[PDB]
């Protein structure tokens, strides 16, 4: 009896205030494209995942559903009668019995905010009402003989988007929330389609909703639909990466600084798999630092596990565990064991490391490191030599890299220059590889080019800041 | 009434620009 009533209060009041203020903002002002309660949906990314998972069988949350699905609200007297009915639909939990809507009363409850003479002028209340059945069901994480019910509720949510496409779409811009809803549902729905085979019908309606946007509206929905396309495009990533790069989808722009990070991660892996490493490293580092708000959120453990993989494919050697965290130090242990081998030149120990932990490397989604990595087993070494010796000979490099034949030792140099690892040139009168130095970085108009972009971005921050201001 | 809805929307759109042009003149001169 102490566990029930306080969730019954705070988890009545947060969403009562959210629904009331969302309807009041979306109708009182027409400029509610980015309302205050939009951040409330950000709270719903983090609230209900730790607030309640099951319907709280000690008479707490099972009564929240039939009250919040009984909404008629014709005018002010019907809404006031709903406020009067709130006391009884509140006390029915704590006094007698919360009704057992045990994982099934979500399908005939679609017409429940149409029963008892309901009018639907606020579409986002129906969007939140279609968002609610995933709270005791897909946020309970069971996935046992239950899949068809979330697919049915998602078809009802699709019918809600058809209602947003056909029934009174007079500049409501509710899709700017609904696509965010089509974020969260179609996350775990994706997990459902992760459990079964390829999501071809999801591919078709994802493309259809991707081109349903842009011409209609464009704010943070097309980015989410693009990313939800591209993740399972990258699942069976066979030849569609050329399609994804020729997919003109750099549009995203504002993405609350979180979705843009994983979009950068996805296109970084696409560009990393196609031998272009130097362009991949900068966008990998950009995606790593874009949203590091919390430590080891799963995303960091994977972008950090791709980052110095592509950096070791480039040739530069950082140590991996320099951000020792609760789930960084012990999760990157064979990662550190592999990155210790590239500084050395032992191939047998590296092969023993790979054969010892090849199952974990296949678990990381990084099958194809080895098919290129042996090239860097020589290449990194010669760049270190090209960093150490400004003028190296032709015969000393044979014993400085244990490359046996002097012609074989002097042939990697005939590739590393051409793709570009070292400025040095070779001449066949001495057999000496020698490089020059750069002094003109500050002497020429190199700093002005970077400074113009920095100045433009910094001064435009002031304009964007002042453009959102005082609202008396 | 959809023709009247379109043209009144087109009327206020090109009329909101003359308010946004006249205020930026007034806010500039009020500094001086």
């Amino acid at each position: 009896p102490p566990p029930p009533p306080a969730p019954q209060d705070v988890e009545m009041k947060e969403e009562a205030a959210t629904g009331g203020g969302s309807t009041g903002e979306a109708d009182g002002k027409t400029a509610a494209a980015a309302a205050e309660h939009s951040q409330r949906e950000l709270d719903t990314v983090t609230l209900e995942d730790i607030k309640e998972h099951v319907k709280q069988l000690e008479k707490a949350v099972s009564g929240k559903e039939p009250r919040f699905v009984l909404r008629a609200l014709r005018m002010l007297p019907s809404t006031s009668r709903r406020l009067n009915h709130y006391v009884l639909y509140k006390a029915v939990q704590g006094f007698f019995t919360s009704n057992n809507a045990t994982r099934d009363f979500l399908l005939p409850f679609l017409e429940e905010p149409m029963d008892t003479e309901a009018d639907l002028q606020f579409r986002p209340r129906t969007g939140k009402a279609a968002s609610t059945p995933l709270l005791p069901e897909v946020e309970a994480y069971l996935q046992l003989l239950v899949v068809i019910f979330m697919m049915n509720s998602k078809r009802y949510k699709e019918a809600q988007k058809i209602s947003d496409d056909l029934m009174q779409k007079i500049s409501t811009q509710n899709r700017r929330a609904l696509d965010l809803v089509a974020a969260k549902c179609y996350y775990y729905h994706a997990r459902v389609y992760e459990f079964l085979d390829k999501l071809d019908v999801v591919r078709s309606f994802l493309h259809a909703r991707l081109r349903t946007a842009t011409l209609r509206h464009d704010a943070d929905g097309q980015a989410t639909l693009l990313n939800l396309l591209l993740r399972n495009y990258l699942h069976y990533s066979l030849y569609d990466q050329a399609e994804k790069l020729v997919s003109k989808s750099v549009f995203p722009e504002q993405a609350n600084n979180n979705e843009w990070a994983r979009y950068l991660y996805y296109t970084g892996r696409i560009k990393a798999i196609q031998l272009e490493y130097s362009e991949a490293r900068r966008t990998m580092t950009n995606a790593l630092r874009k949203a590091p708000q919390h430590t080891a959120v799963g995303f960091k453990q994977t972008v950090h596990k791709l980052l110095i993989v592509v950096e070791l494919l480039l040739g530069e050697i950082p140590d991996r565990l320099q951000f020792r965290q609760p789930s960084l130090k012990r999760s990157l242990m064979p990662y550190f064991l592999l990155t210790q081998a590239v500084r050395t030149g032992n191939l047998a120990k590296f092969n023993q490391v790979l054969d010892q932990f090849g199952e974990k490397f296949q678990a990381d989604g990084t099958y194809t490191l080895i098919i290129r990595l042996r090239h860097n087993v020589i290449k990194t070494g010669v760049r270190m030599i090209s960093l150490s010796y400004s003028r190296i000979s032709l015969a000393d490099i044979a014993q400085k890299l244990q490359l046996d034949s002097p012609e074989d030792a002097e042939f990697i140099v005939a590739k590393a220059i051409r793709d570009g690892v070292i400025e040095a040139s070779i001449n066949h009168e001495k057999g000496y590889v020698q490089s020059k130095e750069m002094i003109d970085i500050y002497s020429t108009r190199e700093p002005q080019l970077a400074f113009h972009q920095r100045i433009s971005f910094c001064l435009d921050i002031h304009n964007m800041s002042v453009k959102a201001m005082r609202f008396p | 009434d959809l023709y009247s809805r379109y043209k009144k929307l087109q009327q206020e759109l090109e009329f909101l620009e003359v308010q946004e042009e006249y205020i930026k003149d007034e806010q500039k001169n009020l500094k001086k």
Partner: protein, 260 residues
């Protein structure tokens, strides 16, 4: 199985490069493309097995096309073979006549100086290709050798191919390797002599001596390699974008002076 369904292969038993069968081969292509379906290939597993048969005879048609020295028709036909090897309902049994011919597709992809399509192509076999694919070990390890200094071993392994010859991509590989070497080093080095590029680029003095003597600049033959030097002058002014700089600085004042 609408009307054709012929006897295994029409002409394959004796020496293959003959032009007699090809037209009816073309007719067989007609008798596979307007029958039920070829692109979705959803149901009717007998038509899928007929598509497998057409795939095998189209592999023999690719053999015939490279036997008559035809690259665009062959690349079109292989491309259709790659289209046919995956189905929308993947139920088709693997025919054994790909484990010596898919590596020919990989060798063609390598020999068309394509490395991006190589590495994005290497996702069909997740972990299968390491144990089996013994003839197909050569096209996938040729990428590994290319990123190594095994070039002399590559020209020695030009004739070590285990199962069957299909020598055409091996010679196109030779041509592209010599072309990449010859067009890749002409600006880092300065001079070459008779010994400083024969065993380094060409061979150990091969019949292609004259072929490399007439290829491009830096001609060789009279006891030293001379003529057609290649370097740079690098002229610069660097004060040309100053007017552009003016634009930039005025814009700065522009952002400083329009009322927010």
């Amino acid at each position: 199985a609408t009307g054709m369904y012929e006897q295994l292969k029409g002409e394959w038993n004796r020496k293959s490069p003959n032009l007699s069968k090809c037209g009816e081969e073309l007719g067989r292509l007609k008798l596979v493309l307007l029958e039920l379906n070829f692109l979705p290939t959803t149901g009717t597993k007998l038509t899928k097995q007929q598509l497998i048969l057409a795939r095998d005879i189209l592999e023999i048609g690719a053999q015939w096309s490279i036997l008559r020295k035809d690259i665009p028709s062959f690349e079109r036909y292989m491309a259709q073979l790659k289209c046919y090897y995956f189905d929308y309902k993947e139920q088709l049994p693997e025919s054994a006549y790909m484990h010596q011919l898919l590596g020919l597709n990989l060798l063609f992809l390598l020999s068309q100086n394509r490395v991006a399509e190589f590495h994005t192509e290497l996702e069909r076999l997740p972990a299968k290709d390491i144990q089996t694919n013994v003839y197909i070990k050569h096209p996938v390890s040729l990428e590994q050798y290319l990123m190594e200094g095994s070039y002399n071993k590559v020209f020695l392994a030009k004739g070590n191919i285990p199962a069957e010859s299909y020598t055409f991509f091996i010679d196109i590989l030779l041509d592209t390797i010599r072309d990449e070497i010859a067009g890749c080093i002409e600006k880092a080095y300065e001079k070459i002599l008779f010994t400083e590029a024969t065993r380094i680029l060409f061979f150990n003095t091969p019949k292609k001596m004259t072929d490399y003597a007439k290829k491009r600049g830096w001609v060789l033959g009279p006891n030293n390699y001379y003529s057609f030097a290649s370097q740079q002058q690098k002229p610069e002014d660097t004060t040309i974008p100053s007017t552009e700089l003016a634009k930039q600085v005025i814009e700065y004042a522009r952002q400083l002076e329009m009322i927010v």
